[PDB]
Amino acid sequence: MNLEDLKLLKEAVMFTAEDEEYIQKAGEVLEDQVEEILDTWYGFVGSHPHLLYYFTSPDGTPNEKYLAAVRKRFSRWILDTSNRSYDQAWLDYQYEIGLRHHRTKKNQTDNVESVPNIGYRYLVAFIYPITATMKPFLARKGHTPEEVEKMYQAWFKATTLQVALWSYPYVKYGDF
Amino acid sequence: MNLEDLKLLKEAVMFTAEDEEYIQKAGEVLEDQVEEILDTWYGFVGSHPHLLYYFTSPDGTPNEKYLAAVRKRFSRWILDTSNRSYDQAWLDYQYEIGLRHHRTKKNQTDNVESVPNIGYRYLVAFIYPITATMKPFLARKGHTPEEVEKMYQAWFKATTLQVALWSYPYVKYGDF
Ligand code: HEM
Numbered sequence: 001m002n003l004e005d006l007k008l009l010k011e012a013v014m015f016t017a018e019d020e021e022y023i024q025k026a027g028e029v030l031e032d033q034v035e036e037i038l039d040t041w042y043g044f045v046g047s048h049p050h051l052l053y054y055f056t057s058p059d060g061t062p063n064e065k066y067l068a069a070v071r072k073r074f075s076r077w078i079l080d081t082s083n084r085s086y087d088q089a090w091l092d093y094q095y096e097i098g099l100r101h102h103r104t105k106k107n108q109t110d111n112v113e114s115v116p117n118i119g120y121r122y123l124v125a126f127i128y129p130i131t132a133t134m135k136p137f138l139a140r141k142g143h144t145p146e147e148v149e150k151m152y153q154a155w156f157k158a159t160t161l162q163v164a165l166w167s168y169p170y171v172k173y174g175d176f
Numbered sequence: 177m178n179l180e181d182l183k184l185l186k187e188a189v190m191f192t193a194e195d196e197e198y199i200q201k202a203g204e205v206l207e208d209q210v211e212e213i214l215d216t217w218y219g220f221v222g223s224h225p226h227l228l229y230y231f232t233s234p235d236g237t238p239n240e241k242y243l244a245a246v247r248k249r250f251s252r253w254i255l256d257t258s259n260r261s262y263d264q265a266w267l268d269y270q271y272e273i274g275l276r277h278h279r280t281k282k283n284q285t286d287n288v289e290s291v292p293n294i295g296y297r298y299l300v301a302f303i304y305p306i307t308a309t310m311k312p313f314l315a316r317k318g319h320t321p322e323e324v325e326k327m328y329q330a331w332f333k334a335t336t337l338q339v340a341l342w343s344y345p346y347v348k349y350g351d352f
């Protein structure tokens with residue numbers, strides 16, 4: 001996609017200049033608390049065997065080196081999402097994040113042997129737990145509940161926007 | 177999909193028996209305000225030419241009979257989502273709703289001529305506006321702010337859960 005297509009997708013998730021201010025604020029509050037955000041996030045993935053599965057070795061046990069490498073890139077993604085203006089380099093990388101969940105690129109970044117593809121049903125599903133994970137963190141620090149709501153809404157839009165972008169390599173050609 | 181697989185998907189959106197109580201409450205609140213919801217929902221769609229596009233005749237003008245027919249089924253959907261328990265018949269219908277946004281069955285239920293396919297990027301994107309539309313209505317029936325937030329979160333889960341199920345015909349065979 002280019003920036004014209006992005007503008008149309010942003011309109012569909014109701015993402016505006018107001019959300020670019022509040023996603024920067026969310027980022028500020030989240031970057032503060034990244035270590036326990038990560039513990040929360042991997043604790044949810046880790047508590048369901050059918051989810052933890054996508055990180056496992058052939059023998060069905062978690063590949064700890066894979067989990068470690070991914071945790072680092074997840075923590076970087078929290079900051080990337082929080083910036084003032086999504087540009088073409090950002091868009092190009094969103095494609096890359098989707099290719100990495102999909103069989104096209106999964107397991108190549110870390111050079112691991114793991115399951116070949118993340119079922120698309122779960123990438124969509126994960127919009128919810130991603131927003132649910134951040135919510136209590138956004139509510140910490142020192143902000144009003146009205147500011148907290150706008151940060152949370154901003155976060156929800158950005159996550160939805162991104163997953164829709166990540167879905168490209170999964171979708172039958174011409175149906176995206 | 178069978179009910180075993182729906183259970184795993186419900187786990188991925190954090191949908192539990194607690195969400196079953198509050199989705200029913202959310203449905204109670206929403207159905208008594210349905211006509212207002214529908215006008216709000218179709219004002220959003222109708223206000224963006226690139227979204228209104230999906231309801232238009234080849235000559236570019238909105239098919240009014242198409243819009244009227246879809247609006248009645250969308251109305252049933254608000255109620256169907258608030259069921260006690262999602263059963264096999266419910267699951268089978270979700271496949272159908274997905275087929276109908278997709279080129280597979282689009283335009284066939286109302287026997288209309290319109291654009292052949294809704295691009296998948298927007299089905300994911302609409303998770304946000306769907307939840308954003310419902311939110312002020314859930315606060316309008318004299319429930320505690322705690323129950324309002326619980327109804328809102330359950331709506332968000334059920335919406336995310338359904339779109340994931342509707343993705344099936346759009347996803348490359350074997351990657352779902
Ligand atoms: C809302 C949905 C999701 C978000 C926001 C998210 C976030 C991310 C991020 C930021 C990365 C690193 C991308 C990079 O290389 O820079 C990643 C990779 C990864 N995620 Fe997700 N993720 C989502 C869905 C899922 C699901 C459903 C699973 C299943 C457990 C999963 C498991 C993985 C795995 C195994 C990788 C490594 C892929 C590889 O080998 O490169 N993710 N995710």
Ligand code: HEM
Nearest residue numbers: 227230246249250253273276282283285298299302303306
């Ligand atoms: C969260 C996302 C969405 C939800 C919850 C939703 C809801 C629904 C429902 C309940 C129906 C009727 C299903 C039935 O036949 O019983 C429907 C059909 C339809 N929707 Fe959506 N929708 C979504 C995404 C979209 C998008 C992005 C568009 C683009 C404008 C759209 C436009 C249409 C059209 C044109 C139909 C008629 C399809 C046909 O010819 O049968 N929907 N939708």
